[PDB]
Amino acid sequence: MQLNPESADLRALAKHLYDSYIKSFPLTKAKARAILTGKTTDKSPFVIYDMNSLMMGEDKIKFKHITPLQEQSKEVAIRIFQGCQFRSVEAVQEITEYAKSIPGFVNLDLNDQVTLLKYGVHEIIYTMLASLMNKDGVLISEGQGFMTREFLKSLRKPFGDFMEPKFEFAVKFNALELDDSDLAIFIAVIILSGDRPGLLNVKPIEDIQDNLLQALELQLKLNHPESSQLFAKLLQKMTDLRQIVTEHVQLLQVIKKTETDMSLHPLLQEIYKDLY
């Protein structure tokens, strides 16, 4: 490894993605970890660990999406699924905004931009969800709430089966001990996968992903001295992300049909559409 104008550009791209990632995403992994360990000056997430705490939390947590005027489901499982939809729709926009900051992305075929986003969004969602998870639960409502793994597992079928796979993945992924600087480049690599179905102008996409991939490896080598193979292990996780996405969609069909009290926001329908 040398310090030459190539590496210097790599590091410059690294910083640009990071800066763009900080402004595009509200709750970074840096802050989530602090909250998750009390090492925070902010209040303290309200813990939802049973039905009584859920009910209480619905009052004492100001959810950005609910209002007293509107009426929501009578079934807690459905209400919780609704807030997750709202959060996912918001997540789609943060990710879209982040994508536009990736050098070159905006100058791609708009139709291909759409295709990269349709497929990358969910992988990036579960990637960044890990930042908010420990093995006990997950931060919600941008850190004002904390919902436990076991409480989510206790929702009536089939809802009690949606988050388990994500916790499973998060424990393995968080053992990589990535930080935001690593993550910023990683999700950029995900967005610019030239092997997504339906792409038309692949060449310029791979040319971007190659830069991203160089910038990532250099980032991992500089930032994780005591863990070789981190680059390979991380690429492997991109595989596992495609599997949990497939599985999530499939289970989502079990919801669909066999449920009717809720429906899927159109943005989410656009994405899940002709997915896998």
Binding site: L117, I271, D274
Partner: peptide, 13 residues
């Protein structure tokens, strides 16, 4: 025949 009108709008602004 746009199958992702919303995403398309999001990207256009």
């Amino acid at each position: 025949t746009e199958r992702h009108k919303i995403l398309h709008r999001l990207l256009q602004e």
